[PDB]
Amino acid sequence: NELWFIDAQAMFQNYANLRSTTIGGFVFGRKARKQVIHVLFAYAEDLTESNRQFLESSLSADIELVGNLNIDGQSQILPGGQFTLQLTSRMLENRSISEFLDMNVMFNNEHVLMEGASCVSRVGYEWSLRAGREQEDVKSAAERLSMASFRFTYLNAEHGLVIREQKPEAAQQKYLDKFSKGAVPYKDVIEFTAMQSLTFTRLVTIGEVVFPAFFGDSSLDLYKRSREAFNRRANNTMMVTVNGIRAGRGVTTTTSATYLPPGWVSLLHLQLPTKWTDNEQRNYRIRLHKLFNLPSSKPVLRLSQALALHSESARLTNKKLIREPHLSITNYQPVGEITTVNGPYNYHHYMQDGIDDSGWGCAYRSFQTIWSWFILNGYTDKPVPSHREIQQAGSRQWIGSTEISFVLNELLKLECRFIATNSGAEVVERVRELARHFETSGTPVMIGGNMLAHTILGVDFNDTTGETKFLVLDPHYTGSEDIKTITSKGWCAWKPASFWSKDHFYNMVLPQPPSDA
Structure with missing residues (x-):
């Protein structure tokens, strides 16, 4: 019972x-x-x-x-x-x-929800494998590494935080509550420096170690977690390494990644065999999909998709950019049925790459957003292009839907679908196939306004009354990189069908993702 x-x-x-x-x-x-x-x-x-x-x-x-x-x-x-x-x-x-x-x-x-902050640190270690005895040493290094971890200390200086072993009585209750309160594991991150007392094949492993900070736990609780966290990463490295040895791929070095697979409410932590062949990696990715019951219709574990929780981690997109602003709309308003964009993306806008596109760049930015979605979703590793780089495909020209679709086609071998419209209030009579898009291709949509360009992230469609709203990310910059200035103002918010000019004609580009990853 x-x-x-x-x-x-x-x-x-x-x-x-x-x-x-x-x-x-x-x-x-x-x-x-x-x-x-x-x-x-x-x-x-x-x-x-x-x-x-x-x-x-x-x-x-x-x-x-x-x-x-x-x-x-x-x-x-x-x-x-x-x-x-x-x-x-x-x-x-x-x-x-x-x-x-x-x-x-x-x-x-019960519909179990995300919870907690992610604590993270870089940790390195060194392992020696006797010739022909690579397998049993790597196993043994790990075991002795797990008895050593109780002596590490984690330190955050900007807040005077220390995680370290401690007698139970020494426990400081509620130790990070300030930081972990309404926190979420995929973006609320307390970074620490991992430290230690100053008192054949050699393999070197360095990488992230991530453990949850839940609201209400004691500095002691934090310590037992950090330690288990560190031991699992070592065992994981051990296991991938042994596997590659038995497969005769040699002794491979690994890359540390953290993911939040679709649907998941706690993170997934993996040491990745990145010195294997591109093909041998794909097969591992597939194997991993089966092991973690990931879905086969799309990529989940590409290096490009790993969260970048540690500041010294290699990212393929700019750290300054905001990831998924539309996921900060707390003031929700569901008028009817919502279909939204499928994966993650970044928010690009005016005054960003040190440039000043006050009039002309609006569509470039939406192009960039659409691009960022393709890396953050594991479809390419190539970085989002600059205006000049898009142009090469004049200088300082505003552009629109038709070239966006084109630049995309030869920088990314990427096919689009088009939706064309006579009037701003004919966008609506097409909301059916626009919802159908988001539930399938699930990519952000560039709407070719008449003088202007916007990105469409989702719809709010009520098939009874027929009332229709649109989730709009506005490429025309207003803030620094402030979330409140973006969510409070109309730069990322829902809009009524009376947002599109009825006098004018609108074009829509609908990016299609490839079929194998």
Whole structure:
């Protein structure tokens, strides 16, 4: 008699993605608060203890194995956490929260939300592998590395924060509450410097180590997490390295990445084998998609998609740019059915790259936004172009929809779809296929106004009354890089159909993403 909580939709969707002999799986969660965070499905091959350990090392430090699952009573079971989910293929494919509750009395369905800040630090270490004994040393280095980690100290100087081992009595309660209060793991980041007391093949590993700061935990709680966080990254490096050795790809160096896969509410942490062949990497990405029940229709784990939480991390887009402003609209107004842009993007505008496009650049900026979406979504690694670079494809000319579609076609081998309009109030009679866009291609839309250019991020469509609103990101700059000046003013806000000039004709470019990544 104990209450566990789970997000059943999320679970069903994971089964969905794997599906995309029999099937079993592992259940990962926050053991103390009896809350399931990740349900990972696998075919019987992958229900190995080896893969269980790979999974756990890739999840956030507060999360561990809490149970496993049995589908239709006929799947392989690997003991084990402290319960087993009972599942049927009926239940799964129909997605019946209805049926799931009857088969699993101690569980409660719940729409589990993101929570907490991300603490991060760069950490490096060195590993020596005896010739021909690479495999068993890498394993052994790790074990002794995990006994060493209890002695590291993490320090933030701009706030006088120190995480370090401590007797329980020394614990400072609520230690980061100021920072972790209504925080979210994918962008509220407290950076630390990792330190230590000053008292064959050699391999060097350096990279991020990210652990959650939850509102209300004690400096002690923070310390146990940082340590587990660090140990999982080492084990992860160990495992990828061994794998490449056994595959005879040699001893490879790794890159540290952090992701927030679609749907996920806790981060995913991975050491990436980046000295493998491009092809060998793709195969790993595919393998990883299956292991973490990611969806196969699109990229999730490209280097380009990794969050850049640490300031010394290699990014492919400018750190100054804002990521997803439309996700700071707290004052929501749902008039009807909302279809929004699919992945992440950046906000480009006037007065940005040290340039001054006060009149002409409006469409360049929207082009740049559309571009940023393509890197932040794993479709290219090429950086967003400058005006001059777009031009090369005069100087200081305003442009519009037709060249945007063209520059995109030969800087990115990228095909568009077009939507053309006689009147500003004919945008609306086309909102059907514009919603259809966002639910599919899900790319930001450049709307070719008459004298002006805007980006469309989403619609607010009520098929009954017919009332229609539009989510508009306005390329004409007003702020410095202030979020309130963008959300309070109309620079990123929802707009009524009476926003488009009825006297004039409008063009719309609808970027199409490629079909394999």
